[PDB]
Design a protein around this ligand. Structure first.
Ligand SMILES: *[C@@H]1O[C@H](CO)[C@@H](O[C@@H]2O[C@H](CO)[C@@H](O[C@@H]3O[C@H](CO[C@H]4O[C@H](CO)[C@@H](O)[C@H](O[C@H]5O[C@H](CO)[C@@H](O)[C@H](O)[C@@H]5O[C@H]5O[C@H](CO)[C@@H](O)[C@H](O)[C@@H]5O)[C@@H]4O)[C@@H](O)[C@H](O[C@H]4O[C@H](CO)[C@@H](O)[C@H](O)[C@@H]4O[C@H]4O[C@H](CO)[C@@H](O)[C@H](O)[C@@H]4O)[C@@H]3O)[C@H](O)[C@H]2NC(C)=O)[C@H](O)[C@H]1NC(C)=O
Ligand SMILES: Cc1nnn(Cc2cc(C(F)(F)F)ccc2CCC(=O)N2CCC(CC[S@@](=O)c3ncc(S(N)(=O)=O)s3)CC2)n1
Ligand SMILES: [Ca+2]
Ligand SMILES: [Ca+2]
Ligand SMILES: [Cl-]
Ligand SMILES: [K+]
Ligand code: NA
Ligand SMILES: [Zn+2]
Length: 804
């Protein structure tokens, strides 16, 4: 209930909201059906439009006008944004040359440069180039400020998850806004775009920037705008707030445009109808910048122009129907469209089986335009699992397609655009420009992820960020000043360096190897290798630091070095360098099933071959590949029991092709590579390293835990004219986190040779180094020549494999 008979007089776009039944005058009151009776009359004036004209200059103030051209308007803070251009001979901001903003040039009383976030819905990254002729204000912000070629959104690439990620620095799984539509089974409640459940605070986790600011004594303008407030009025409201007294004036503001998304859905991303929305957005930027210039704020404010996601060509004829695969289609609930999420229609149906739904959806049609996953099997880079609002069964839909339950859902076309697909898809990428005293001048930065921006907005305002998924410091290169200078994390566990401590006969592991094959030149030599003489070649960036409490050993070899876990009975990491000139060899026939005890590591902290023999599902692989041994004698090291890891036969196909073919391919293409590989245990799919008590599967009969995934980090010189092991400058990296699965059901062409499917699999499971850090508790690149912030940027890089 709302007692709508209060008044909005002197309360228009008030910044503190009032409690029901008292009526509201804030920028969300329309969205709550709570505005006072006179809110339209007083707060949404439109009389005489939005621009001063020659005949209005010096007029007598008429409070009915939408904005003013009278002499007092500047000190009142309510002039039309073009007032000084029409009435005082000034130039539009867009017509002024770019001039470096070295320091904030702010009116007295400003304690910090304000931040204005200019957010645009569905603003696809390529609009910056393809629309540049019709967006002169945006183009000047871009060329004169700091810009990225694109900014990566989060998955799903929809509005609500992405705006809230922008606001919090959190993945959707952590902030809780996992879609535009959700069912929370603990609440037993549904969140939808229409309706009122979405206003309940219980959906919205983390700490968004406006709360962060308020808690630390920095005032914030309200970020949300009811859809019927026109853009001109949003801009004028911000500019009016910027004229508040010092004690009342916010330091952080957001504008939001529903365009170009709205028109994109109707017309496709490049429909000829798209030029006009782009022009109109540009005009709105121009109104802000002119208005800031009038207030002497154009060289004071930091402005961020940022999108939530892009837009793809999608029509209703490109819909896949679950009714074509499932016999039981009425026993499921589908969240449909550019992704799918499936759960049982009724929790009383004991016949509902996810395994049989997955199987009925797996590789059933030759051109099938979606792929089912149990959520824990989705690519780890999507970080899309650890939330009860994310259904166990997921469908990753191909770009340009939809999925629906039944044909009647789609005809009971309108639309030519949509979005929501995998966040590496080129059409889903969006934009970032920063312009202001605190951003760099005329500077292009590499693409980055939108989860990073919260930290930077905090830096811009002198705020300590709440705990988030950004890597704070990774975007320091965007900033002229207010950089954040973190210290590397301290190592928690120091390694042991075991020497030869065990005789061969102390091992009863059921392993065999044909290696009784016998010199002081080459005996001193092999001793030096075991003591670390080649470690500078294979460990190029220092050993990784272990950031949690555990017991592990460093093991040196000619060809590779490893950090061996006494708790998990395998390496945490294995590091090796393969030059451009390295040669690939086969496993000799006599060594095919060779596994050799490691005389540095106790039988009690070793794996055993008998467990693998007994476990009919599980085989083994090696982390340092025998194929890349530097010599026949060095090859014996590769068969140590301490280089062995549990592998499903199905996975061995993948891993063998990576090791035998791809590593050498990358070393040829990149002029040598350094490789760090290892196991990952994430049984609770939270993106973080499991403790021992979280492990759900062991090699039958043993204490050997089975990884959920295998990683590799592949580093070389960014200047590929220099070999990876003699690189003077910046590094280049690509990484993956491969799911350790007992079948290759994910890969529909897996019956073909590995050359036709393995690399496509690996591309899908591309990863950042930081993703592997979360998953292992390890900290990489500890000893380079490079600045730490540069290394943090390196750690957030994702190799996406999309074209330009
Ligand atoms: C991305 O960045 C984020 C932010 O840094 C990372 O998320 C953090 O991860 C931590 C570990 O998973 C986690 O720490 C836990 O916090 C518990 C207190 O949590 C509440 O308070 C905080 C602080 O304000 C708040 O942020 C939390 O918000 C979550 O939950 C609400 C619902 O209340 C949601 O609205 C909100 O969206 C958010 O949800 C997300 O996180 C929760 C987990 O907290 C998930 O379940 C959701 O799916 C969603 O992803 C909470 O309101 C604290 O109680 C935990 O303590 C347990 O573990 C410790 C280990 O130190 C143990 O010693 C204790 O005994 C304790 O265990 C007891 O409870 C167990 C569970 O009931 C029980 O099994 C035991 O037997 C014990 O009784 C723990 O410290 C932190 O909350 C989140 N923060 C956020 C915002 O998500 C994230 O990891 C990053 N991602 C990556 C990939 O790096
Ligand atoms: C979510 C969310 N989380 N935090 N915020 C606040 C926020 C943060 C930022 C940030 F962080 F960048 F700084 C910027 C701007 C805002 C305000 C957005 C705003 O005023 N909105 C009201 C209108 C809504 C339209 C839905 S309908 O038009 C559609 N729904 C879904 C659609 S689609 N395109 O199909 O996915 S369109 C959007 C929100 N909003
Ligand atoms: Ca959007
Ligand atoms: Ca985990
Ligand atoms: Cl959704
Ligand atoms: K076996
Ligand atoms: Na297959
Ligand atoms: Zn949209």
């Amino acid at each position: 209930w709302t007692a709508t008979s209060g008044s909005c007089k002197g309360r228009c776009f008030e910044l503190q909201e009032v409690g029901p039944p008292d009526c509201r005058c804030d920028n969300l009151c329309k969205s709550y059906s709570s505005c006072c009776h006179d809110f339209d009359e007083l707060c949404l004036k439109t009389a005489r439009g939005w621009e001063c004209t020659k005949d209005r200059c010096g007029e007598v103030r008429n409070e009915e006008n939408a904005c003013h051209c009278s002499e007092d308007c500047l000190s009142r803070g309510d002039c039309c944004t073009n007032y000084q251009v029409v009435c005082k001979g000034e130039s539009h901001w867009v017509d002024d040359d770019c001039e470096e903003i070295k320091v904030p040039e702010c009116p007295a009383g400003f304690v910090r440069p304000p931040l204005i976030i200019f957010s645009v819905d569905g603003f696809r990254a390529s609009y910056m180039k393809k629309g540049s002729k019709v967006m002169p204000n945006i183009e000047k912000l871009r060329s004169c400020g700091t810009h990225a070629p694109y900014m990566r959104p989060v998955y799903p690439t929809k509005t609500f998850p992405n705006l809230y990620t922008l606001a919090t620095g959190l993945y959707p799984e952590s902030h809780g806004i996992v879609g535009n539509s959700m069912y929370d089974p603990v609440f037993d409640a549904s969140f939808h775009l229409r309706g009122r459940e979405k206003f309940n605070h219980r959906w919205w986790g983390g700490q968004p920037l406006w709360i962060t600011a308020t808690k630390q004594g920095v005032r914030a303008g309200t970020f949300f705008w009811s859809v019927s407030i026109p853009h001109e009025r949003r801009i004028l409201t911000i500019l009016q707030w910027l004229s508040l007294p010092d004690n009342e004036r916010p330091s952080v503001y957001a504008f939001y445009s529903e365009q170009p998304d709205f028109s994109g859905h109707k017309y496709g991303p490049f429909g000829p109808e798209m030029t006009n929305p782009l022009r109109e957005i540009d005009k709105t930027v121009g109104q802000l910048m002119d208005g800031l210039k009038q207030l002497r704020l154009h060289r004071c404010v930091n402005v961020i122009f940022v999108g939530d996601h892009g837009m793809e060509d999608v029509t209703c004829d490109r819909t896949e129907f679950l009714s074509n695969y499932l016999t039981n289609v009425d026993d499921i609930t589908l969240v449909p469209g550019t992704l799918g999420r499936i759960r049982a229609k009724s929790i009383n149906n004991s016949k509902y089986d996810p395994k049989t739904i997955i199987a009925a959806l797996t590789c059933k049609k030759p051109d099938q335009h979606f792929k089912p996953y149990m959520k824990q099997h989705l690519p780890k880079r999507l970080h899309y699992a650890n939330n009860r609002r994310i259904e166990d069964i997921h469908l990753l839909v191909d770009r340009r397609w939809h999925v629906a339950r039944k044909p009647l859902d789609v005809y009971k076309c309108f639309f030519q655009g949509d979005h929501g697909f995998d966040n590496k898809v080129n059409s889903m990428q969006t934009v970032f420009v920063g312009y202001g005293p605190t951003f760099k001048y005329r500077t292009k930065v590499p693409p980055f992820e939108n989860i990073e921006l919260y930290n930077v907005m905090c830096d811009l305002l002198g705020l300590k960020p709440a705990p988030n998924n950004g890597t704070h410091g990774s975007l320091n290169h965007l900033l002229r000043t207010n950089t954040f200078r973190p210290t590397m994390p301290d190592e928690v566990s120091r390694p042991n360096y075991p020497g030869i401590m065990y005789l061969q006969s102390e091992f009863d592991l059921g392993c065999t190897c044909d290696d009784k094959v016998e010199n002081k030149l080459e005996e001193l030599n092999k001793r030096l290798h075991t003591k670390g003489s080649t470690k500078e070649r294979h460990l190029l960036y220092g050993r990784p630091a272990v950031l949690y409490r555990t017991s592990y050993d460093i093991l040196y070899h000619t060809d590779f070095e490893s950090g061996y876990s006494e708790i998990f009975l395998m390496p945490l990491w294995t590091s090796y360098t393969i030059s451009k000139q390295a040669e690939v060899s086969s496993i000799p026939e006599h060594l095919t099933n060779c596994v050799r005890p490691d005389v540095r590591v106790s039988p009690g902290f070793s794996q055993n071959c008998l467990a693998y023999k007994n476990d009919k599902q599980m085989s083994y692989g090696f982390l340092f590949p025998p194929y890349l041994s530097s010599s026949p004698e060095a090859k014996y090291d590769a068969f140590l029991v301490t280089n062995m890891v549990p592998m499903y036969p199905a996975f061995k196909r993948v891993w063998a092709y990576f090791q035998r073919v791809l590593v050498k391919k990358y070393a040829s293409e990149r002029n040598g590579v350094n490789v760090i590989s290892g196991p990952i245990f994430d049984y609770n799919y939270d993106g973080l390293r499991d403790t021992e008590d979280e492990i759900k599967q062991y090699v039958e009969g043993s204490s050997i835990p089975v990884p959920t995934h295998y990683y590799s980090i592949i580093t070389s010189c960014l200047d590929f004219t220099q070999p990876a092991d003699k690189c003077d400058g910046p590094l280049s990296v690509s990484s993956f986190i491969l799911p350790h699965r007992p079948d290759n059901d994910e890969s529909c062409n897996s019956s073909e040779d590995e050359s036709k499917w393995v690399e496509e699999l690996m591309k899908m499971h591309t990863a950042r180094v930081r993703d592997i850090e979360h998953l292992t508790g390890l900290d990489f690149y500890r000893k380079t020549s490079r600045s730490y912030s540069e290394i943090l940027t390196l750690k957030t890089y994702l190799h996406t494999y999309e074209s330009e």
